[PDB]
Each structure stands twice: as C-alpha cells, then as structure tokens.
Amino acid sequence: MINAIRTPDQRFSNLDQYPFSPNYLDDLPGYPGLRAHYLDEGNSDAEDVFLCLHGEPTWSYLYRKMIPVFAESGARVIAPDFFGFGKSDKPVDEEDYTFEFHRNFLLALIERLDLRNITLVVQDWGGFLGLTLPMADPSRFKRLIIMNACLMTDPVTQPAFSAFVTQPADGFTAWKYDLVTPSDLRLDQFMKRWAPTLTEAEASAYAAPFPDTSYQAGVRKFPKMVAQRDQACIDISTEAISFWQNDWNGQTFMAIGMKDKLLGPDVMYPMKALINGCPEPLEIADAGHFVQEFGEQVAREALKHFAETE
C-alpha cells in the first residue's frame, strides 16, 4: 500500500556501542505491512517506562548512552525508530510522511504496547511530535525529560518557535540546506558537522540505515515540515501548548545544549515558561543540538532530580 523499502540487516553488523536487541511490529493499525523497530530495554515489568523519541536525521542509536542509565535505575526503556529511520521500514515517497503520519504511529505504538507511567524523553522531532502526545491520553504520562525541542505552532502565537527557521543563516537554514539539497547525502559527514565530538565509528552508525538516497525520503521531508507547517500540525501543536501550560501536573527536567544554533536558549527559555512546573534548566555548555551525545550526564541528573520528588 505504502510503497516502502527495508534496510539490509548487514548494514548494522558493525555498530559501535549498540548491543541492544531488536523488537519489531508490523501490525500497527494504519501502518499495514510496515515494520517498525524499537528497543525494549530493562525490566519489562517495571512500573516506569522511559519512552525515548529521536529526531532528524537520527535513530534510536542516539539514545545509546542514556538507555543503560535508565535501565540500571530499574526502568523499562522503549526507543522506537520512526518509519524512514534506523531499522524501521522506509516509505519511498516524501508525500507519505506527514506530521500526523508520524504522530499516529506513536499513539499506535503506545496503545499496542500498552505503555503506562511514561517518562517522555524528547529532542528535536522527537519533541515536535512527542510534546503533542500527552493531551491525547493524559493518564499514561507521568514525567518529561526535554532536551532542545519546542512546538510547531504558528508564528503569531509563538514567534520563538518560528524565528530560528530564517535566522541565523548558519542555523536551521544551513541545516535544511545540508539535508534536502545534496543528491548524494552522506549522513556520517552531516553528523560529524553537526555533532563535532562524534567518533568516526559513531558517525557511520548514523549513515548505517541509508545505503543510498532511495532510502532517505523521510530524512528529506522532516526539515521541509519545519519550514512548511500544515494546518493539522499547527492546530495540534497549538492545542498542546494549552495542555502544557494548564493541564500538565507531572515532573519535568529540562536540559539545553548551549552550542545549538537551532533550538538553544532563545527557544528553550520560552518553552520552559509554557511547561507548568518546569524547573531551572540544566545548561550543558559543551553540547550542541544532539544533547544526547552528552546523554549520560543528562540521564543521571534527570534521575537525580526525579528522585528528590517520588
């Protein structure tokens, strides 16, 4: 139905620090014959579940340094790969990927696995999408760990969530250009640019899912959706703001990668005001957009903060 391709399994043979066993679902409702990959780590009977959402242009490999810390605390960790990314299947046409298409998969996943007592861990697209999930079923969400992310609202209601698209030239403009223009997109090169501390090995794990451009339709569409917000995304994101400001009563932990040109402090302080009860942020000076590459410190501090209220 949805024409999609699948990454050969040998592409992930030599992954660095990725000893997690795959789990798949190819029976989600709305996603017929599409196989989704996700990690299920720690005790599968734990009370607490960390749902780790990744963004553009990565996969669950991004949470590889946080996963073990959350699991050792006694929690179950779910880290799904969105369709078009990591080990999940990849639809071939960019038109298949929409805000709701990826949002509905997350609601499908959550219902399917029956996740409860969720600690939402988001960043980037993990957050554009994931911050709109709680209002759908408030009872399954109990905590949030938010790294550089915001809501894809309209420019008027929140200019801070729209300004970064145009300025500065070396921020989101550069980012989108690097991703949607090359006809020969090398994700290892892109990642080493955007996450200067990655080793060669780690950079190649980010390119691992895409043997050639025919596999990167989802990678291509995400930046375009930051640029061109459809009505449903706007409506839903706008309504999530209200949920965070007035309905949210859980615990929150915010961490900012201070070197981020995209969603750094001019985006995160405003986000911090809209999230009821959000405490002071943990500013990580050396981290850029991929805060998770400095993930062990974030996981440990968040658990620390969470223990001093539970």
What is the rounded CA–CA span in Å between residue 301 and residue 44?
23
What is the rounded CA–CA span in Å between residue 22 and residue 35?
12
Q: Is 125 annotated as a binding residue?
A: yes
- Examine residue 288 and tell whether it contacts Cl ion (CB under 5 A): no
- Is 26 labeled as catalytic in the residue annotation? no
CB of 85 or CB of 222, closer to Cl ion: 222
Kindly write out the interface string for residues 48-87 of this chain, putting x where it contacts Cl ion by CB under 5 A and - elsewhere. Answer: --------x-------------------------------
Q: Are 260 and 289 in contact (CB under 8 A)?
A: yes
Q: Which residue in 126, 223, 257, 295 binds Cl ion (CB under 5 A)? A: 223
Q: Burial-class residue 293 by CB neighbours within 10 Å (0-12, 13-18, 19+).
A: buried
| Interface positions, 232-251, toward Cl ion (CB under 5 A) | none
CB of 57 to Cl ion, least distance (A): 7
Catalytic residue (choose from 48, 81, 96, 260): 260
CB of 178 to Cl ion, least distance (A): 11
Determine the longest span between alpha carbons in the chain, in angstroms. Answer: 50
- Examine residue 97 and tell whether it contacts Cl ion (CB under 5 A): no
What is the rounded CA–CA span in Å between residue 138 and residue 150?
19
Catalytic residue (choose from 124, 184, 266, 286): 124
Peptide linkage before 168 cis (omega within 30 of 0): yes
- Is 212 labeled as catalytic in the residue annotation? no
CB of 227 to Cl ion, least distance (A): 9
- Examine residue 222 and tell whether it contacts Cl ion (CB under 5 A): yes
Catalytic residue (choose from 37, 54, 102, 289): 289
String of DSSP letters for 103-131: HHHHHHHHHHHT--SEEEEE-THHHHHHT
| Residue entry with tokens 């996603």 | 31
- Is 289 labeled as catalytic in the residue annotation? yes
Handedness of CA 272, 230, 233, 30 (dihedral sign): negative
Size of the site for Cl ion (CB under 5 A): 4
Instruction: Point out the annotated binding site for chloride.
Output: 125, 175
Q: Which residues bind to Cl ion, rule: CB under 5 A?
A: 56, 222-223, 226
**Residues known to be catalytic:** 124, 260, 289
